[PDB]
Amino acid sequence: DPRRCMRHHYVDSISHPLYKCSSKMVLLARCEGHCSQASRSEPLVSFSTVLKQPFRSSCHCCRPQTSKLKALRLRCSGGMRLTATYRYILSCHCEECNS
Amino acid sequence: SDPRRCMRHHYVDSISHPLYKCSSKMVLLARCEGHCSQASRSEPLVSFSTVLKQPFRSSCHCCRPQTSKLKALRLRCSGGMRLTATYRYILSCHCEECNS
Amino acid sequence: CAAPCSCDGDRRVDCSGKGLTAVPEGLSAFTQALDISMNNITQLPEDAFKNFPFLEELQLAGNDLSFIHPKALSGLKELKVLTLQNNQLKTVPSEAIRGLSALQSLRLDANHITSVPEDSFEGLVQLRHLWLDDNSLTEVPVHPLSNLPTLQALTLALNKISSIPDFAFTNLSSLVVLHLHNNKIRSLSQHCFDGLDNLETLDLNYNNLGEFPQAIKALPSLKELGFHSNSISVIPDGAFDGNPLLRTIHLYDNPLSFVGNSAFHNLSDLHSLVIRGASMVQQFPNLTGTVHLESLTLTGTKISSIPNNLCQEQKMLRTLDLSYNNIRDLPSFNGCHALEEISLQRNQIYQIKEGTFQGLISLRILDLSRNLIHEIHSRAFATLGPITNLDVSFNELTSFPTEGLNGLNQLKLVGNFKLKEALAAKDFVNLRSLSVPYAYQCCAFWIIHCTPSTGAFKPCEYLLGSWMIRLTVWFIFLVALFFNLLVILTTFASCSSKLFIGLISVSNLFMGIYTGILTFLDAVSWGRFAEFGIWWETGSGCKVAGFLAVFSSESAIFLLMLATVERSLSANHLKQFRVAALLAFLGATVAGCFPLFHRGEYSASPLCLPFPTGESLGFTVTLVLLNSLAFLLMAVIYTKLYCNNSQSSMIKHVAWLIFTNCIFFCPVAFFSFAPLITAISISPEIMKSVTLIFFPLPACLNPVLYVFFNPKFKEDWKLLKRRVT
Amino acid sequence: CAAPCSCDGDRRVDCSGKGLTAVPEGLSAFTQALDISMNNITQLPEDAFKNFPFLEELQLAGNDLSFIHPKALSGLKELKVLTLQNNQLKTVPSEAIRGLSALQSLRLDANHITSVPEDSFEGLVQLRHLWLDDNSLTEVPVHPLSNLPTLQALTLALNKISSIPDFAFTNLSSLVVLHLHNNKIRSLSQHCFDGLDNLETLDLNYNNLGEFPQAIKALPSLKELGFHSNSISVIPDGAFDGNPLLRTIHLYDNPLSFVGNSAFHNLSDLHSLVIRGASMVQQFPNLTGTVHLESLTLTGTKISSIPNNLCQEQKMLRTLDLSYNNIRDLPSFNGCHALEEISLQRNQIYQIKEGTFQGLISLRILDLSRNLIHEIHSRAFATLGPITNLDVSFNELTSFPTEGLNGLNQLKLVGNFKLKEALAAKDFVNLRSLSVPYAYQCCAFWGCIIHCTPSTGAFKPCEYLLGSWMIRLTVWFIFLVALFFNLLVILTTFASCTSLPSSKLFIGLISVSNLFMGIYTGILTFLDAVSWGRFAEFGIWWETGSGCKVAGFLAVFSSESAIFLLMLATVERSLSANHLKQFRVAALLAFLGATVAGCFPLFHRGEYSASPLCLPFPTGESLGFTVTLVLLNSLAFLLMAVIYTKLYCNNSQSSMIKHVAWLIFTNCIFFCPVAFFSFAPLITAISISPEIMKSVTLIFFPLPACLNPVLYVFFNPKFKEDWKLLKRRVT
Structure with missing residues (x-):
């Protein structure tokens, strides 16, 4: 089913804002799709004078599970070997937004 | 008008005070439920500095109240006293972001 | 937006607070929710909702509505929620509520409905929630209720239903909630709940x-x-x-x-x-x-x-x-x-x-x-x-x-x-x-x-209190005992008012012993009146002490009351006088022994006083009263002789003694009647000090009056003392 | 699970980081991602992945792989990502990646690939991302590139491509990213980018x-x-x-x-x-x-x-x-x-x-x-x-x-x-x-x-010119003394027409020089008395104008003149122990030189502009003639001591002699701090504060001027008291 919560791939080109930093293209993965559990927002009935969070809500979002941090080094036309980092998703699923 | 969009439902709830001896009440309530058509995602956030404050830039859409009212009900207990219950009746519902 | 009421929202017109009748004209024809509750509309004319063909929720609570035209609710094929509480009718709307096949929730509570027509609820094929509470229904509408197999909630509370017949709810296979509380139900038939297999909540409170x-x-x-x-x-x-x-x-x-x-x-x-x-x-x-x-x-x-x-x-x-x-x-x-x-x-x-x-x-x-x-x-x-x-x-x-x-x-x-x-x-x-x-x-x-x-009535460290009082009581024991010694020896050694002098001497001896008991008791336990208290107050010591105090105090007063009469009679009977003295000691013994048998007394202060805190308003109150009753007659006879050698010396000695007794007895009585006048609160320890100071005070000062201040027969005895020397 | 691996994850076996030389055995056959990067596998045998039929992602980076069997990648019909960077493949394996129709991302960078076979990339009908950088390619593989109409990213950077021929990319209608930087490209044909209608990024940095x-x-x-x-x-x-x-x-x-x-x-x-x-x-x-x-x-x-x-x-x-x-x-x-x-x-x-x-x-x-x-x-x-x-x-x-x-x-x-x-x-x-x-x-x-x-700093104060209340009382006294003394002294000398000896004569020169300096000190004092506690608005007008030049010539002319003048008297005594005519001509030349020496710096730039006193050598910021004034006071002083050693080598003459010796000794004694303070950077002078120096400079530089006008007057009453009795007659 092409409409389930899946892990996709794409490319981005990385270059430091400052510095005649040299260029480099790398491969990235994101999460995209629809989850089967619907959302709801049911009200809470309270007797206390001071009210509180008026609604008890629930919502599932396709969110990452496993990430491996990576480091990538470029040349910015200078002595400094600037290193950039990101998180490599290795798996994605549904979880409560306000878990 | 797909029967699975973000719309508002109704139901009768049971209201009664937990401590005092109170005559219970049936209250009509509303609730929102349905699937939003905007797909949710989560992308990596790349940074050339040295610390990862936030590592992913999400989007997620949820069906949440737009305009609620605050109505209240005087459970009429016995032996004097009239405890008061309060709640917000969902007047309308729509799809908004989880964080924002 | 359109029209002059609130109208604010998404297809949601709310004209509740202010209005009159006929519903707002000029509104959009796509309104899906109209809230015109809390207004002065008393009648719905024919075809009164022909400008809102897409209305879904209608609220009419709080109006004075009493007549609905059969064709008023025409064209509302999308209506789902209809609220009509807090209005006035004498019949379930009926006719008008027949073309409402899409209706799901209906509120008919807080009205004056007392009859349910048999043709009612015919046409509502999607009804789910029904309110029928706060009315004057005297029976369950079994037949009309047999037309709604899809009903899920039902309330019949706050009505006058007496009994439920057989097969009342034999056609509601989806009901989940049922309320029947605050009614006069007193009988239920055997086959009355058949067919309610999905029911989960049952309420039967406040019935008979x-x-x-x-x-x-x-x-x-x-x-x-x-x-x-x-x-x-x-x-x-x-x-x-x-x-x-x-x-x-x-x-x-x-x-x-x-x-x-x-x-x-x-x-x-x-x-x-x-x-x-x-x-x-x-x-x-x-x-x-x-x-x-x-x-x-x-x-x-x-x-x-x-x-x-x-x-x-x-x-x-x-x-x-x-x-x-x-x-x-x-x-x-x-x-x-x-x-x-x-x-x-x-x-x-x-x-x-x-x-x-x-x-x-x-x-x-x-x-x-x-x-x-x-x-x-x-x-x-x-x-x-x-x-x-x-x-x-x-x-x-x-x-x-x-x-x-x-x-x-x-x-x-x-x-x-x-x-x-x-x-x-x-x-x-x-x-x-x-x-x-x-x-x-x-x-x-x-x-x-x-x-x-x-409090002071129960001290944890010092019985007596300040060192001053401690030095004051040691001096009384050392004086009175020794002073009250030679005096009796003279009279005792050698077999009138002179008798009551020796008689008053004896009365003092017992009082001194009491004080000595109190002083000895104070010297044995110093800075440690914690483990010597219970044993002292829930045991034999207190009773003896309270009879040597009561016997001695009461005896002296009583004894002091016979000497004055003796002088009055002198200014034969000698035989009677001895018999009179023997009877005072016996009474004093009774009066003393009387409190030794009842309960709660000799248990108010560590001194075992007759009236400490006055917590026995009997003997203690009577004793104070008797103390003054007796004190009154002596003063009367004194004023009487006052109205008109040795006799003068005796008389003088006896007057010094009574004056002294009367002068010394005023604080004890004064402290007995505290709650009546509050005495500006209670002496923290002053009373004790006063009580302690003043209650045994006459037992030493009094005997000294005729000792040398009034040497009549006492001076004869001193000369007899020199003779023995 | 197996010994050298995690095998832990949602069917994601990771064994990277170990020393495995072959594909491990004993793993599930439902593994969908294998990461065996950074190991010692140098060759893939035939049918080496027959226990992972459902594998989708494979990582082989970091190995020493140099030979792929044509049938090694058999049965991997679900493979989508294949990374082969940092290996030793001398050529693109064309016969080993043929059966990878589901392949989408392929990394072949950091290898030693220098030839692209013409039959390569035939069978990959779903390829999207391609890496071909960090290699030794000398030309664009136009023909092999004409087999991938669905390619979206391409990186041909860090290689050795010289030119792009006609219609190189005439079949890539979906390319969005193209990198060609860090190459030797120096020529581009007219029809070389035709057909790239969807291209958005172009990078040709670091080319020729x-x-x-x-x-x-x-x-x-x-x-x-x-x-x-x-x-x-x-x-x-x-x-x-x-x-x-x-x-x-x-x-x-x-x-x-x-x-x-x-x-x-x-x-x-x-x-x-x-x-x-x-x-x-x-x-x-x-x-x-x-x-x-x-x-x-x-x-x-x-x-x-x-x-x-x-x-x-x-x-x-x-x-x-x-x-x-x-x-x-x-x-x-x-x-x-x-x-x-x-x-x-x-x-x-x-x-x-x-x-x-x-x-x-x-x-x-x-x-x-x-x-x-x-x-x-x-x-x-x-x-x-x-x-x-x-x-x-x-x-x-x-x-x-x-x-x-x-x-x-x-x-x-x-x-x-x-x-x-x-x-x-x-x-x-x-x-x-x-x-x-x-x-x-x-x-x-x-x-x-x-x-x-x-x-x-001290060389430029804001309130007091002179400084404390002691140095102000000391300069008022010199002006009040010196000015009075030198005046009467000279008035007495140039009184009698009686022929005037040179000793006695030279004595006139010292008094004249003292008068000259007193005028400078007096200028400095007057100048100090006019502006008290307010040396802010009177500073710029004084240092960037005519005052400083006159003062610096009355100081230089007077200091240098005295020294120069003090140098002729010693020689006169030495010569006495005829020439009277020559002696007058020698004095006129010293004043002229002094005038020249004084007037010299009055023309060059940056001098008389280091302190508010207009000192000859303040802060020594002219190391020429300021350092030349020092040279004069020095070599001159040296030669002057020689005549005294001579008088020592072998009445009035003795008095004169005594009077001249007291004067030179006094001058030599008094001239030591001024020279001393000049050579500070060489010895750092224990970091002299700029205020003591000023105090010393201020105290000691005009100090000899107040001695001769009165000291030889009363202290030398031999021929001088004779002339005093003389004017006493003039009374």
Whole structure:
């Protein structure tokens, strides 16, 4: 089913804002799709004078599970070997937004 | 008008005070439920500095109240006293972001 | 937007606060929700909603509406919610509410509806919620109710329904909620709840049912049941048989008398059970299957035993109240891990064994007051660490262990009388509230804020008080005893008013002994009036002292009353005078001995005073009254002789003595009537000081009046003293 | 699970980081991702992945793999990502990746691939990303590249491609990213980018392009273009014509010389433009259409004017640097609301009018240094409120307004020489950094955290010239004494026509020199008495004017003259122990030299401008004639001691002799501190404070002048008391 919560791939080109930093293209993965559990927002009935969070809500979002941090080094036309980092998703699923 | 969009439902709830001896009440309530058509995602956030404050830039859409009212009900207990219950009746519902 | 009312929102026009009739004209034709509640519309004309063909929710509550035209609700094929509460009608709208096949929720409560036409509710094929409470319905509309197989909620509370006939709800296979409370229902037929297989909530509170309903054996999905505030007295053996999914039962405010043994058994979903007032129950109920109870309450029954298998299967159990029963053996409690509160007050528990209280980690409140417990071992307390309240009062305790209770925050041990030992103050560091059996206990015991609240009347360090008073009483004993010695020797050695002089001499001797007892008692226990108090106030010392004080004080006064009459008579009878003296000593002895038999006296101050704090308003009040009654006549006779050698010396000696007695007796009486005049509060220790200072004051000063100040027969005796020399 | 691996995860076996030399066995057959990177596997045998039929991602980077069997990758029909970077594959395995129709991403970078077989990339009908950088490819594989119509990313960077032939990418209709940087490309054919209608990023950085490429007129979707670090020198008129969606252009590090006028016009998506080094550009570029610029930079050109409609046409500008140009007239800047930084340094701006800078709310940094600005009105300074930096240096300013600049945090006004007025200290309360044209100008900000640049010390005080209350009483006494003494002494000498001996004669010279110096000390004292506690507004007028020269000639002329004069008396005694005629001619030449020596520095630059006393050698900041005055006082003093050693080597003469010895000894004794203080940097003089030196310099430099006028007067009463009795007769 092409409409389930899946892990996709794409490319981005990385270059430091400052510095005649040299260029480099790398491969990235994101999460995209629809989850089967619907959302709801049911009200809470309270007797206390001071009210509180008026609604008890629930919502599932396709969110990452496993990430491996990576480091990538470029040349910015200078002595400094600037290193950039990101998180490599290795798996994605549904979880409560306000878990 | 797909029967699975973000719309508002109704139901009768049971209201009664937990401590005092109170005559219970049936209250009509509303609730929102349905699937939003905007797909949710989560992308990596790349940074050339040295610390990862936030590592992913999400989007997620949820069906949440737009305009609620605050109505209240005087459970009429016995032996004097009239405890008061309060709640917000969902007047309308729509799809908004989880964080924002 | 359009029109002049609020109209704000998404297809949602709200003209409630201000308006009159006819609904707002000029509105959009796509309005889906109109809220025109709380207005002055009294009648709906024909075709009154022809400009809102897409309206879905309509609210008309709070109006004075009393007539709906049969064709008023024409074209509203999308209407789903219709509210008509707080209005006025004498019939279920009927006709008008026939073309509402999309209707789902309908509110008809708070009206004056007393008749339900037989043709009503014909056409509503999607109805789900119905309100029919707060009306004047006298019967259940069985036939009209047989047209709504899709009904889910129904309320019939606050009406005048007397009985439910057979097959009343034999066509509602989807009902989940049913309310029938606050009605006059007193009878229910056998076949009256058939066909309600999906029902989950049943409410039958505030009715006049006479016998437990046997018709509840037809709702397998029933989960919550309430039948409180009824007249049910007997619960039959094996009642909740066809309701295995029960989770909440309300049965309080009923004159229950008997409950079957095998009645609450085999209920695995029940979480609480509170039974009170079952007078004719003498056996513990069977609970083989009900193992999910979190609060058990059984009070007011004749249960004399407990099956210890109970604290086994009940794994979770948080509160337990078995008060007001005939329980005398404490069956072990090992196994109730989750138990926190135990109430066992008002029972016949006599011992506490080693193994009685164990497996009690989460105990926190314990109540054992009024059980007549007298033996408590040194065990059954270590296993219960986090314990704060320990109520053991009005028992027959003799020795209270102090092991494993260091964590208490409130202790109640008031009422015991055989507990005269002193409790250790180092074992109740965390203790914050204390009540003890006695005051010395308090004394002894005394942010704690103990209940006895010892004052000057119960000092913890000095009996007498300031060193000055201490130096003042030592001087009286050393003087009076020795001074009151040679005086009697003369009279005693050698067999008129002279007699009452020796008679008054004797009266003083006893008083001095009392003071000496008090002084000796003060010198033996210095800076340590804690362990010598209870023994002194709950024992034989106090009685003797209170008869040497009463006998001596009262005797002197009485004795002082005969000398004045003797002089008055002189200004034959010698025989009578001796007989009169013998009778005063006997009375003084009676008057002295009378208080030695009644209860609560000689138990108000460590001095064992006749009237300390005046807490006996009998003899003590009468004694003060008699003291003055007697004092009055002497003063009268004195003024009488005043109206008109040796005789003059005697007379002078006797006047100095009475004046001195009268002058010295004023404060004691004055302190006796404090509550009437408040005496600007009470002397903190001044009264004691005054009482202490003044009550025995005449016993020394008086005898000195004729000693040398008035040497009549006393000077003859001094000359006789020189003769003996 | 198996021994050397995690096998833990949602069917994701990771065994990377171990020393495995072959594919492990015993793993599930439902593994969907295998990561065995960074191991010692050098060869893949036939049918090496027959236990993982459901594998989707495979990582083999970091191994020493050099041989792939044609049938090794058999049965992997679900493989989508294959990484083979950092290996030793000498050629692209064409027969090993043939059965990978589901493949989408392939990495072949960091290998030693130098040949692309013509049969490669045949069978990959779903390829999207391709890496071919960090290799030894010398040409573009045009034919193999004509088999992947679905390719989306391609990186051919860090290789050795020399030229791109015709119709190289004429079959990639879905490519979005193309990298060609760090290559040796120096020529591009006309029809080389045809068919790239979806291309958005183009990178040709670090190449050897000699002429601007005209082949870029074929990419309508192009958005980012970079050709920086090339050899492009001329940009033709009307270049970015077929690229209307451009948003970023990099063209720095190029020897640009000429840019066409109508070249950057009609670019509505461009947000920045930085041009530097265009030497042969003399007109402002046309920008009719480019109205979304946020940073404009044009420096190093011959632009002399600025269109009056620069700001009106475009409202997006934040920074502007029109420095290193020939701009002399500034158009009205009214209209650039969002403008914040203006750099206009190194231009020919001569005036500032009222309406030049009216209407700049967001302006924060302004730079107007080195423009030769001399007239500034009292306007064009109120409309700009939030202004912190104001750099106006090395200009020709004569009067600086102080209105509307109360909010400054850093001010630079160093370099001006015609601004001698004092700036109000109450108008720069918020100021924190200050630089000023004259030293004495710091007396007003740093009292009398700013940390002004001149940093006035003892060599430049603000309140007392002389200093404490002891040195003031000491100089008044010298003036009052010396002046009285020398006067009477000379009046007595030049009284009798009686023939005057040279000894006695030379004695006149010493008195004359003392009178000369007293006049300097007196000038200094007078000068000290006129300005007390207020050495702020009397400092600049005194050091950049005629007073200092006269004083420095009455000091130099008097000091040098005395020494020179003191040098002839010793020789006269030595010669006595005829010539009377010669002796008069020798004295006239010393005064002339002294006059020359005195008048010499009165012509060169930077001297009589180191301390407020106008000392000959204060702070020694003229190491010539100031250091030449020291040389004179020294070698002269040395030769003078020799005549005394001679009188020692072998009445009146004795008195004279005694009087001259007392004078030289006294001069020599008194001249030691002045020479001593001159050579401080060599020995660091234990860091002498600039105030004691002044005190010493002030105390000791005129100290000998007060001795001869009175000491030889009373102390030497041999021929001197004779002449005293003489005037006594004159009474």
